[PDB]
Design a binder for this molecule. Sequence first.
Ligand code: PRO
Ligand code: PRO
Ligand code: PRO
Ligand code: FES
Ligand code: FES
Ligand code: FES
Ligand code: FE
Ligand code: FE
Ligand code: FE
Lengths: 397, 397, 397
Amino acid sequence: TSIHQRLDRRLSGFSLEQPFYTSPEVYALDLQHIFYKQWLYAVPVCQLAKAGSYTTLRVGAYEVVIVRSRDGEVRAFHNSCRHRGSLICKARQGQVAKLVCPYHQWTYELDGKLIWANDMGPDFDASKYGLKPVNLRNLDGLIYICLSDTPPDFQTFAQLARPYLEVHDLKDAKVAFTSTIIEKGNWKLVWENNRECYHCSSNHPALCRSFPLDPEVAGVGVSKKLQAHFDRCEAAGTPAQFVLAGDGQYRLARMPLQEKALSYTMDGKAAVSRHLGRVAPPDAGTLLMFHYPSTWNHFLPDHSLTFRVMPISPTETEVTTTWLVHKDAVEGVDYDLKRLTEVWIATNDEDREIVETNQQGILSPAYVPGPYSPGQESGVMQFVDWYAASLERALAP
Amino acid sequence: TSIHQRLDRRLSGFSLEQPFYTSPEVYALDLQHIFYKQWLYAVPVCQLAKAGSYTTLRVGAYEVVIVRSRDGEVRAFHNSCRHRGSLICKARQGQVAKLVCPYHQWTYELDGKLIWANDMGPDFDASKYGLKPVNLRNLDGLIYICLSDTPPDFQTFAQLARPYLEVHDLKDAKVAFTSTIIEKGNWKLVWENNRECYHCSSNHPALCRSFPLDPEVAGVGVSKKLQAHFDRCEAAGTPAQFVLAGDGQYRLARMPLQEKALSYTMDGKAAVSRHLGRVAPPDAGTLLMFHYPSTWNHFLPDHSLTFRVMPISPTETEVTTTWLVHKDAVEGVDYDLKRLTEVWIATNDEDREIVETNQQGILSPAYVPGPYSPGQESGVMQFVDWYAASLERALAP
Amino acid sequence: TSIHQRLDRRLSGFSLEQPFYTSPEVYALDLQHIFYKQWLYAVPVCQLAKAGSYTTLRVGAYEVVIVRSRDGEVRAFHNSCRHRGSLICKARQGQVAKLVCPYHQWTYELDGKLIWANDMGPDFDASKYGLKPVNLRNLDGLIYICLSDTPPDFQTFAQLARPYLEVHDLKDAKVAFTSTIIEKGNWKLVWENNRECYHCSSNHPALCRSFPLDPEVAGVGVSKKLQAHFDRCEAAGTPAQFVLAGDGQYRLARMPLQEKALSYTMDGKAAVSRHLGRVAPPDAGTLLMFHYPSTWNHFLPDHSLTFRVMPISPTETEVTTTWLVHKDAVEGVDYDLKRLTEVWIATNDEDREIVETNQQGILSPAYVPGPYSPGQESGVMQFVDWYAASLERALAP
Ligand code: PRO
Ligand code: PRO
Ligand code: PRO
Ligand code: FES
Ligand code: FES
Ligand code: FES
Ligand SMILES: [Fe+3]
Ligand SMILES: [Fe+3]
Ligand SMILES: [Fe+3]
């Protein structure tokens, strides 16, 4: 049975046939046609504070390095020396004056240009051997990248998102904490787990203290209560109302939290007393933003969290959660690290366990697609449709 | 060279060509056509003492859960939720009132029926989404399962075995100890090592204290001495005589132990003073039972041992040894754990080492089939014939 | 794209296209057509001091055992029992009277002949089941082996090398220390790193104390200074001048060390005060010898080092460094272990890091061949040409 036959018979209301989650062949397609073609969230721009600042990340097999150039611009490059291929930047992050390959010291300017290569002979044209660039966008303090030489349109999304994101002043953030975990499940299982709160009341004690179980929230017809919340927000100049991509790729919405909760904390109060951004009112709740296939996000009035999904192998996915707070917020004074992070560290561990347990069942040959819940899992259906549709376009001659 | 060509030129008196032991392609065939089609030993029924008792096990990629239902029946099921596939029972064993998937709490009755699924909408037919059953037989206190929807005939074997097994009262046993090890050799190498005692006098000091080296014993024309033993047994009402399957799949025989030995112990005396079953005479020796591809077994007058062979990968096999004793036998009083187990724990470690060393040599491209010993390894020849024959039937259009 | 197309478009002055370094398909070809067909360095003969001495090693999947026979001859054999395939010698090295398989004790004489096999029946012809021999050459105290039944010509190389090697009296050495490491890079990346000192001044602080950075040295038109050194050597009866194989497979040359340095030590003085061999003058420098695909070597006046390259997987290579000193040299008296070894232990660690970092960049799909330095990396070009040419001959119908 071919991939085309599997996609042809796929019905929208059901989880995917086994190979989509477990086969190396579908993983190769997901990499080639999804992760290698769409725009991807990489890191907050505040990680590249000073010029010479760099951060590295792997995308599938690609080795990418992101650096802040001399001119103040942020640029991305393939982290592979044009000489014999070596990684140039081995550390996760750092600062340098120049990009100097540790092998033979071919030296690049922070804009990728090869400015010195020892003893290469008279016929060497350095202009042909600068670092290969990687398409990059700055989404209001959040760095996105695209590995395709023919990137899809980012602008529609950026323009739609700017109003919602700019009120968080992400450019003025610092990273208060980063958590990187590996979940032993296909990247799609990670997203499907993320696009429903069908599993929340049983699996997320801490999260449920502040994050609503309403399917309307964590999922994908605006109710009265919700529109009322949108209104308080927007009356205060804080964009809030539902926005969904034409093609399902992204969604933004500022949702209310559980009664009285202001933030993702055990007591429900703000985690940080010096807010990141100018969100109003204090109880504006959480701006949810997703953008397939790479990222979901929770921007709160006091602090923000980005999540980055990166594929490791058919049955492994790296999830990186970044807590953003105001750059002048002081740990121990303006916030407490444990108190800031504990809820989502626990929620993440609980999701990992769940995803991995899901994956283990799926690996049984007895596993067959099952029906998603119309009322609790329409967001899951929504993601799978976007996924299949994307896969089909890419596979079309 | 195809599998059909390899099987076509195979001569019975020789070990198999390399790929049978080391290739992923033969492993896939062994799983599909052997482990997924034949009956397999799973666990003693005494592990499912109370209703709501369950135990889980993996067979190849299949995730199986075995549970004792409300009606006192023992049933097996695919351990994959009909919603989105998750394992329902994560622990190795436990008790529950209901099968409740930890993901979204789809809840099943202990007979597999879906009795509650949250918010699935009016068009949801729970009768279509009960757990998938797994064929199950109870062989006189030993649970066997078959992953095929068209199971082979178990009854011929069961009827032949009942007389030999029933005198052990396995229904009244408890598990005194379980040992699970992984041997780094193809599952067939584990069986070939098991079907001869050609290697015993050099590799098994402890075992050799009580278990005879006679090829007639551990192997596959009844001598005088042996028939005499069969006779003492059967004169005492204890079935003993050789039984071999028409097609070689199974064999039963109650063999004498080394002079004076009554059990698998360092001193040769009984391990347990409260016997499991009603075997007579005291020196009835050991009932050997094998059933390809899953199990060999030693039932003694005082206690019994089952062994379960499960494939992990082309070059890994899980062997699970279960010591059964009478349910009222008291550890520290009626038997001593170390004394009960030490012989076969050591024998198992020694076999693991041997199998792994065998496998390592076999992985050399220089390895070619070699001649089995007619007198010491006819049981090995017997197993390989059953194996090849099984493979050929399954491959026949 | 086929291997033939990749080889067809390959230009000599560039590093290889990705799959040569990372694909399982090229790894299978390298094993089949290179490592399994060419002569390979195994161990110094002094490791087989006494009769019954043996040493074992893996070559790709092949399991080889090398033993010193009763007649004083050194022979090699496939380390797989002719019965059911088991390794016969499990230890890395040892002594035995006979080769006795630990499984069923089939017993071989040290020349491979099967002299005893228990109970194999009247139709058993032991003459058909002796250990399979492995072609073996003794290169003046260095044991080489060839896994092909139709070995290439070793004699041209041996005759060319004898004059250079014999003055080191390798037959009179002992192993003072062995270091085995795994580098996470393709075996070709290990060689390319070895065939240039383009990376030396930045990566090898210790080595650079005594080993010259002149490309003429570590690389592949004899300058005045160098010929002068050749002359001092050969005037003293010590062969020194450049020898390169017709087909690029091997090279020998006795190069001068850094000003005043006599050996690979932190202080530059001799490591051992009792010299191995009769090299003269004291500052004769280092005899470099390479032989693709298995070995590079540094023979100094006081002691010698062999390096053995063996493939582990597409992206892993085992490098084994052996320090040879005179058999009567006494540790703690005639040399200090740390002082003898520290330079090349560090150099090796530094190379491992470099190779692994090279490999990591290469695994990016963005990696493309790049230009080798004509003046610093002609030795690299030389190795890659030998490699491609070898691969092409072997692939020719
Ligand atoms: O339970 C969680 O953690 C995520 C939040 C959005 C939907 N599910
Ligand atoms: O040696 C052993 O442990 C097994 C027992 C039956 C044949 N070989
Ligand atoms: O740097 C090193 O260690 C090796 C020596 C020969 C060429 N490169
Ligand atoms: S690989 Fe970067 S300088 Fe050689
Ligand atoms: S997977 Fe079992 S309830 Fe959703
Ligand atoms: S495998 Fe060597 S004696 Fe049986
Ligand atoms: Fe969750
Ligand atoms: Fe055994
Ligand atoms: Fe080096």
